[PDB]
Scaffold this active site. Structure first.
Site, short mmCIF file in Angstrom:
data_model
loop_
_atom_site.label_atom_id
_atom_site.label_comp_id
_atom_site.label_asym_id
_atom_site.label_seq_id
_atom_site.Cartn_x
_atom_site.Cartn_y
_atom_site.Cartn_z
N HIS A 141 0.83 -1.20 0.00
CA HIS A 141 0.00 0.00 0.00
C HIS A 141 0.86 1.25 0.00
O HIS A 141 0.34 2.37 0.08
CB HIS A 141 -0.97 0.00 1.19
CG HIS A 141 -0.33 0.27 2.51
ND1 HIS A 141 -0.16 -0.70 3.48
CD2 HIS A 141 0.17 1.42 3.04
CE1 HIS A 141 0.42 -0.17 4.54
NE2 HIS A 141 0.64 1.11 4.30
N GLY A 177 3.17 5.95 9.70
CA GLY A 177 4.53 5.86 9.21
C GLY A 177 5.32 4.69 9.76
O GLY A 177 6.48 4.51 9.37
N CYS A 192 4.41 1.52 9.29
CA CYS A 192 4.26 0.38 8.40
C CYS A 192 5.61 0.00 7.81
O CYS A 192 6.39 0.86 7.38
CB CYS A 192 3.26 0.70 7.29
SG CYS A 192 1.57 0.99 7.87
C1 LIG Z 1 0.93 2.62 7.67
O1 LIG Z 1 2.02 3.43 8.11
C2 LIG Z 1 -0.31 2.87 8.52
C3 LIG Z 1 -0.07 2.55 9.99
C4 LIG Z 1 -1.18 3.06 10.90
S1 LIG Z 1 -0.86 2.71 12.62
C5 LIG Z 1 -1.95 3.76 13.50
O2 LIG Z 1 -1.22 1.34 12.88
O3 LIG Z 1 0.50 3.10 12.91
N1 LIG Z 1 -1.41 2.06 7.99
C6 LIG Z 1 -2.61 2.57 7.69
O4 LIG Z 1 -2.91 3.75 7.86
C7 LIG Z 1 -3.63 1.58 7.12
C8 LIG Z 1 -3.55 1.55 5.59
C9 LIG Z 1 -4.39 0.46 4.93
C10 LIG Z 1 -3.78 -0.40 3.88
C11 LIG Z 1 -4.09 -0.97 5.22
N2 LIG Z 1 -4.99 1.86 7.55
C12 LIG Z 1 -5.36 1.80 8.84
O5 LIG Z 1 -4.57 1.53 9.74
C13 LIG Z 1 -6.79 2.07 9.12
C14 LIG Z 1 -7.85 2.34 8.30
C15 LIG Z 1 -9.01 2.48 9.12
C16 LIG Z 1 -10.37 2.73 8.88
O6 LIG Z 1 -10.72 2.88 7.56
C17 LIG Z 1 -12.10 3.01 7.26
C18 LIG Z 1 -11.27 2.79 9.94
C19 LIG Z 1 -10.82 2.59 11.24
C20 LIG Z 1 -9.48 2.34 11.52
C21 LIG Z 1 -8.59 2.29 10.45
N3 LIG Z 1 -7.23 2.04 10.43
#
Ligand SMILES: *[C@H](O)[C@H](CCS(C)(=O)=O)NC(=O)[C@H](CC1CC1)NC(=O)c1cc2c(OC)cccc2[nH]1
Ligand SMILES: *[C@H](O)[C@H](CCS(C)(=O)=O)NC(=O)[C@H](CC1CC1)NC(=O)c1cc2c(OC)cccc2[nH]1
Lengths: 301, 301
Positions: free
Chosen positions: A41, A143, A145
């Protein structure tokens, strides 16, 4: 003596962390030999994240669209491919800091160390357990990921996790190093549910053995029980049922302390029903299930 | 989001650990430039340990009586001296993996990462806090002496601890990297007592702010209080008195959450007087005091 939550030394994994940028998205990557693994992603815009066709999106990306940095040295990308939810970028240089490593998919209840990184720079390291519902209770900011979880056996690093997202309940999700998610999750921007979490019974028993080895004492009774009667209570307190294989893996600790597994099960039943009444076990007011039997043996001996 | 107990990446410190053997006693040493720092009691037999005269014992030791190993590479000792409870061995080779480093003496209540090693090989890493009675609740086994605690700011490693002994109560004691013990402890084989331990109030408040940042809000009440009225309650429950300087250090968290320090002190007063009534804060049944405000800021932002 002493018993603390302990992570593996992260140097061998620090030597492999790099920064991967695609367009305006920047995350972490694992540099092993002449390959860099990262979440796919990375190739997505905020708008693609709602419903991405990763095949079509990756077809629109060429080698020069990926900026890879190890320290002050950029790595020229000479190839790119997609394995499940993981992106593999073949670069022109092999990482001289590449350790002996393996890719392993861990079972629920097993533990590993997580190296939280940002912009390819390691920020922290902490121990984690794979929950029965295939999530982990970690500490990740946007960030992070590409950060990895791993174990170390002598000089071999078994990578087992790569972070991808956080669920609405605050727990985190990710894949193995081959791109396959742990659990029923997908890398899309949708609210996804995890299953009902349960307590890892064998880990609580191993933790009680660790407490006994370290001098904590008051919870031990001169009672015993059977697997059936203990399971009757485990169901009532949302604990996993105890199997004879779980009894077998607790063998070394049971022999070291000289306390039968079923005796410790009776003690655990008493602790579950009465609580602690103000006391603590290893400085904890709650029963901990984040330590496998092998973790206990490795730490205490 | 999320909040776990987090240690610094240990690679820079892993690059400095060596094995020091003097007679039959083997422990760990810190290799910086062309000097190796270790505990002096490495020169003691089990017999001298009761009440050793370290000057007399050191006089009877030559350079060749010290064996230093970095991995499979022998380090020839060309000089030796004693600074307080620390032994300094000048060797013929300077450590190429020497990071930018400082020697710091930390205050009670501050935290640092411990790299537990055995025979010069790193075994684990975990986070510790210097208790008000100048002890740490760690995980050490025989042979861990010489293991170090440290912090990392950008690229500079501040060493602050070197392990020496375990007290009868199970807590652990040590020195700074200049050989001066933390607390009233001496490096001899005797049962020694530590002072009364108290809860680090500023750390508990920082942990409550971290809880608010991560969603936990049930403990927030609609009340407020004075520092004097708060210290009245804190004195009863073995909490350290809060100062205006401590209130200033909690400034960034108070601004980020939009919750005044005194309102959070009122919440803490209510938590101390009433308990938690079965609930948990950040998955904990006890009020945690092992997180400094800077730890909270660094982890959550
Ligand atoms: C990548 O750096 C990022 C890490 C987030 S964290 C808070 O865990 O450090 N990942 C994301 O932002 C991902 C990206 C998608 C491809 C997997 N998305 C989420 O973590 C995400 C999306 C949602 C939604 O979407 C509707 C609703 C509730 C929670 C949520 N988390
Ligand atoms: C060094 O590797 C060793 C580490 C012990 S531990 C359990 O903390 O990993 N250090 C010691 O064994 C020191 C040596 C002396 C110079 C400080 N001794 C103790 O830790 C020690 C000695 C006692 C005694 O002695 C009568 C009684 C109770 C506890 C105790 N600890």
């Amino acid at each position: 003596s002493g018993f603390r939550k302990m992570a593996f030394p992260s140097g061998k994994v620090e030597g492999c962390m790099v920064q991967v940028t695609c367009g305006t998205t920047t995350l972490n990557g694992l540099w092993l030999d002449d390959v860099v693994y990262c979440p796919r992603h990375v190739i997505c815009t905020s708008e693609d994240m709602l419903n991405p066709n990763y095949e079509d999106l990756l077809i629109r990306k060429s080698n020069h669209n990926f900026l890879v940095q190890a320290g002050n040295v950029q790595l020229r990308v000479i190839g790119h491919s997609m394995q499940n939810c993981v992106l593999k970028l073949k670069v022109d240089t092999a990482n001289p800091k590449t350790p002996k490593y393996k890719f392993v998919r861990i079972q629920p209840g097993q533990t590993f160390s997580v190296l939280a990184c940002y912009n390819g720079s390691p920020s922290g390291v902490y121990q984690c357990a794979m929950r029965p519902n295939f999530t982990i209770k970690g500490s990740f900011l946007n960030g992070s990921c590409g950060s990895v979880g791993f174990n170390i056996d002598y000089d071999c690093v078994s990578f087992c996790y790569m972070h991808h997202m956080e669920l609405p309940t605050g727990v985190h999700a990710g894949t193995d190093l081959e791109g396959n998610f742990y659990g029923p999750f997908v890398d899309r921007q949708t609210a996804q549910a995890a299953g009902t979490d349960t307590t890892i019974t064998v880990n609580v028993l191993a933790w009680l053995y660790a407490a006994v080895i370290n001098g904590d004492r008051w919870f031990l009774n001169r009672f015993t029980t059977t697997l059936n009667d203990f399971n009757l209570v485990a169901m009532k307190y949302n604990y996993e049922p105890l199997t004879q294989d779980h009894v077998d893996i607790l063998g070394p600790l049971s022999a070291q302390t000289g306390i039968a597994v079923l005796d410790m099960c009776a003690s655990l039943k008493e602790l579950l029903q009465n609580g602690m009444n103000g006391r603590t076990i290893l400085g904890s007011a709650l029963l901990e299930d984040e330590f496998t039997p092998f973790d206990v043996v490795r730490q205490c001996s």
